[PDB]
Subunit: 233 residues, 6 copies
Amino acid sequence: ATPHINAEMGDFADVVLMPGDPLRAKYIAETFLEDAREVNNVRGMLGFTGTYKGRKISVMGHGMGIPSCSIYTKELITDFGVKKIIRVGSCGAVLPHVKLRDVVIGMGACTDSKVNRIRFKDHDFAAIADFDMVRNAVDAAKALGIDARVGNLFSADLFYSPDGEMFDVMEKYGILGVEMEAAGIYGVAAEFGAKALTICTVSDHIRTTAAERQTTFNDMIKIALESVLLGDK
Amino acid sequence: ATPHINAEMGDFADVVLMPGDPLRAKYIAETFLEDAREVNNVRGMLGFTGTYKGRKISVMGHGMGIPSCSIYTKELITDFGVKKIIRVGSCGAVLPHVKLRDVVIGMGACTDSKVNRIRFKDHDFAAIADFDMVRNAVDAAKALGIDARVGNLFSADLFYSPDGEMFDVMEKYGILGVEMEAAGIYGVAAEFGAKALTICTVSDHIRTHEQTTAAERQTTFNDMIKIALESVLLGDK
Amino acid sequence: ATPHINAEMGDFADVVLMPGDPLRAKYIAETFLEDAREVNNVRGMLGFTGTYKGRKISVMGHGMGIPSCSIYTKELITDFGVKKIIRVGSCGAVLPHVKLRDVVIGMGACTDSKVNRIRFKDHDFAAIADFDMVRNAVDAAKALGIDARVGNLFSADLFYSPDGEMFDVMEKYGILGVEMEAAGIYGVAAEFGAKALTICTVSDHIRTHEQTTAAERQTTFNDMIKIALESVLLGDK
Amino acid sequence: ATPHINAEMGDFADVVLMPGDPLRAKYIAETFLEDAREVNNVRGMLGFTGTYKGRKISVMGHGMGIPSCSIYTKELITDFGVKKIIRVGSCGAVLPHVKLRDVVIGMGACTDSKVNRIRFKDHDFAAIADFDMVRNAVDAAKALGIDARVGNLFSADLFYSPDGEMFDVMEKYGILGVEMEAAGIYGVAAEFGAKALTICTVSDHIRTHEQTTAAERQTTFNDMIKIALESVLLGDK
Amino acid sequence: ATPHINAEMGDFADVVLMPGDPLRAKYIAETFLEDAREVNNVRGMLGFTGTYKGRKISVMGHGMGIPSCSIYTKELITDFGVKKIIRVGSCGAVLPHVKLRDVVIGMGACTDSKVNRIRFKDHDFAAIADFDMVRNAVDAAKALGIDARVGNLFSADLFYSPDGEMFDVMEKYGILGVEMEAAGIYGVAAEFGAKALTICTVSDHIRTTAAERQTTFNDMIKIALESVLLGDK
Amino acid sequence: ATPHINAEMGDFADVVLMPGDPLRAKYIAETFLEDAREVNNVRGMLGFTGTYKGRKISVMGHGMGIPSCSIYTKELITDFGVKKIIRVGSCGAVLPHVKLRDVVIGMGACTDSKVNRIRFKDHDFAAIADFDMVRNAVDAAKALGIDARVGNLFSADLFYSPDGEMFDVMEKYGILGVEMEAAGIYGVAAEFGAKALTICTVSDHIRTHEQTTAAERQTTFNDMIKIALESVLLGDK
Ligand SMILES: O=c1[nH]cnc2c([C@@H]3O[C@H](CO)[C@@H](O)[C@H]3O)n[nH]c12
Ligand SMILES: O=c1[nH]cnc2c([C@@H]3O[C@H](CO)[C@@H](O)[C@H]3O)n[nH]c12
Ligand SMILES: O=c1[nH]cnc2c([C@@H]3O[C@H](CO)[C@@H](O)[C@H]3O)n[nH]c12
Ligand SMILES: O=c1[nH]cnc2c([C@@H]3O[C@H](CO)[C@@H](O)[C@H]3O)n[nH]c12
Ligand SMILES: O=c1[nH]cnc2c([C@@H]3O[C@H](CO)[C@@H](O)[C@H]3O)n[nH]c12
Ligand SMILES: O=c1[nH]cnc2c([C@@H]3O[C@H](CO)[C@@H](O)[C@H]3O)n[nH]c12
């Protein structure tokens, strides 16, 4: 139905989970979803639709960077009727107190991208997530025994930045984690009138064992899934 | 004491309520506080300290604009050991569904000011409030039967803006209300490692040019203050 | 009346003196004005009208920062028929030769604010004062035996600036003093077709961190006010 | 091995063909290369290494957008000894005379991204391709009897731009096609001292709305592939 | 002594008048100066040094645009010991009340150039002239019976601007005249610690007889020359 | 006739050689052209029209800086039917390996000017030359046994830049030479739909400080002249 998504209206649920890695999308569907069916494959950007505790939910990769996720997110909302978007991924930590395996919830998202400036007449647009979604995620985490940190994330355009000094600035301002999509997703949601949220796991420290990482990653997914159920009520 | 605050460490509580109008600060201290005492009068920016249900609380005006509030908030944090700041004021609505007397909670705050760019290497700094403070405010409101709206606020530098088209963009992006301090307070809090939040009551409709009434104002004003105060107690738990 | 000024057309003279501190406005009206009367108290921003040597003059505080002063200046011009605005305040010195208690006249005003960019299509708008007003001020000072310095001022948005290197640049470019309103007032005057000027007294040295004394302040303050008042008379000729 | 590439030094040839679609790389490898082998699959970003007319060559997808392609190109240059990068993608046409399926050579690349400004002290960095590479491609097209336009491309960050008027500006300036990565690739090449070039096939008209299908873009653009391949051989001689 | 000025220290007076047209520089020297000697010719940018009422003064063209005048001005101050610079030229009017042949004095200068931003950390630098020089010029004019307008000038980078809307903005903000060098000259003076001033004659209206124009032009020059004498005392 | 050119339609050839120095144009005309005639003298900006190997060609100075050359190039294109513009100037080298007297071909041009941003909605406009013209020049140099580097140039607004660190950035990005007009010329050509190209002779080293003399730059750079002239003939064939 779209140049980037070879699917039809109704193929996706009203809620969609989005990891950056398409392979991760498949992983999620196979692990947590029941009766998951492949719903998209153009450009290898795998998309699936299944059920979670009797609840219809979709999962689809978003690619790396603001421009990539911006395409997918907009299309989903606009052409597939998606109402809520939850980005599940990884991030780099700058804060000394922020440890590996920590779960971070992006209430807001700083960025070095020019996308929001283009949309906001060159002014300062505060890219924020949906309040309810944030609280639902916090509660869900709490129920699982996880203590998620809520704050600002930094969506970078350059993974390999020439400005190392920027990290000091981020630290000074309390940035929780460093990723590359949050701000873009928040911008699209506000622009198209949808609800978004971004959850990440500290994959590394800008300043563990395999089995350990994976456990936390799964925990993050569960938090996301559970938060959706909470929101339904 | 500081260049703008004629007080000493300990004169202020760990949390302070800040209205824009100094006159409102006196009203609050007299109406909701117990055993209140004046702690500042420099430049007529009245400040008081008292208790609310046994809890120590401070109240002081911040003036109009980011630059003004930035001065007070900074001093409070650095020289008075203030941990939480709650701004209570009015705002203009742009959203059709946003009605007068409505209560708005600024989870975030957009702005046309250059303050955050100066701080953030010219990048986009998302001026946000403390999550817990937001949650607490929402709960307190609910407990009082009030339906507060949580979203983005727009902190303007120019009350009398030469660019009216900006209002359309604001509406477009779902901004809840327009005021002139939020973004500055959030920037200061982040810079100094403090917690802040701004609650506003819809004073008028930027669109359908329709102002509220003194009566409605007074009442809604009281509610907002109740919400803020109660929210503090919740945060203490 | 206006949202910020509880007065009616005619309550204010064609020219108004504006200090930042409302308390200073009262002092001026009581000390230099004759048959003065209060015309505003909203938000504690005291305003008065009286005469000086038979000449009708008004005095009112403007608060701190560009956004604050922008509101008052705009209202005065548009709703009160004010033709000339004279800001009288303090400033910080960056220039080694610029000594404390020194009188500075802002012919122009640099700034880190975004207000003029919003007005000027993002280009460089030179915020300047009225030439005649500058000349008059210089003459009045001379007549009083005071040696006023005429140059550029720097209107800052952040009193507590995170970028200290900016001071070196200021020094480099010969800026006379740093305050927080000039650029905003000049922008408003140009936008509404009014005349403005800002006179400041060196309160402290940004560099050799050295503040003035209450005594020296009071005296120098009086001189500045004398200069401003006398300058008005000259302009009337 | 790198964080985004599960390969080792030697797996990649000195020159790499890069389409945005990993599926297109697979197609290229299986249809144009000889004895091609999969050298990368991380994130599904297929990468292959085969032979073309005796010449060792690689093919790998770069994803959509400047931030995506920036990562891959950098790693290739720094950890795989890649010296030349040839992007082979699609683009939207703005010019009336620019018909579909047309082949455009990006000698230069405009952009709305902030990446180059970050590297260039906020100045204007002209993102250009390697001259030799451009010429090689021009001659190759000539030899294949294929018409190819050489000019400026526009690397957009927003496929779904809110600024429609921008298209009129692009048209006025003669931009040949609108894509999403050229400028980023050119910036990386200059930063890491490598040679790059971008070739595109008009896959749609922003004006008319004559977009092609996915399957199309995925396996239909052979012409541009030939040019790229042939251009490499020329560079060798 | 310099790549743009083939002269030696002492060849120029401490004060120099600068028109945009080199041919105009020659014209000034021949008309108002006594014993004027050619002091520079590289690039055809004529420079002369003579006397005016027994006062040593120089005259040299500056070229069109901020970048051109910036070179000349800096060199003069830095390598020739010049202390005061007076630009004498023409400008376009935007204000309805601003008539042709009117004499405008640039107390300040707005601009669309990025030069001052580069110098001022991207902030707003108010490019202004020297106060004394302004007053001296005002007085001089008054003595000649001319009523000069004192205000803001607009130094444009693009003579042939693609932004016609800018003219409305200028008008709204009270811009007196439109030229292309003032801001640049003011920037250099502040940077190198010198004194500058710009005087112009409304050559045209963005909204007369030859003999008329010329008379006013001469008047402007006289004002400039006289203002210098005033400053000497 | 135009406001800056005292000539008439027909006085100029379809292609024009433009040096910054009017004196250099005179030199070119008298040393390389046949039966050359002065077609312009306004402002001393000498312009001539002669013949080269039977080919009608013009030569005219453009002055120093983007704003200067912008005026001349525009008028030429719009009122004199000029189709091709070849700038022949000097430049300062930043690269260590870039020796003096070297000939550089500006395929692209970076800049610190705000002109292109004004035309390009504040985005990044890649100022590039005409491909054919570049190739023609490359072949011409080859035929004359002259070595010529093709790459990016940097069009500066400030010859005497306050930002010395900018040179390190230029060096890192491989800029071939620093001049003051290429980017402006390229912008005009695109705006008015004309073809342009800039060739330069290294007249000094920003690093070493090996600058040449005025007389030099004025009549010594023959090599670049030949290339330009010869390149025109190629374009004809
Ligand atoms: O330390 C980090 N920095 C930047 N991005 C990331 C990411 C995420 O992983 C991808 C980069 O490999 C991006 O999609 C980004 O969102 N994880 N960890 C980091
Ligand atoms: O419609 C509005 N626009 C902008 N600011 C405000 C405000 C608030 O009131 C003051 C100005 O009236 C500012 O301090 C601001 O916080 N109320 N209503 C509005
Ligand atoms: O050193 C200084 N810096 C910035 N502003 C000021 C000011 C003035 O005083 C107030 C803040 O103290 C502002 O209103 C400003 O106008 N005085 N001294 C300084
Ligand atoms: O009309 C268009 N506009 C913008 N980008 C593209 C693209 C290219 O294809 C992908 C988006 O579909 C991006 O990688 C981009 O480079 N194709 N067609 C268009
Ligand atoms: O109407 C006008 N617009 C822009 N510049 C000028 C000028 C001056 O003349 C030259 C443009 O021809 C520039 O050097 C500029 O300073 N005169 N009249 C005008
Ligand atoms: O080292 C240099 N830097 C900057 N511009 C130039 C120039 C050129 O020569 C003139 C300045 O001398 C300008 O027209 C400019 O293009 N030559 N050498 C240099």
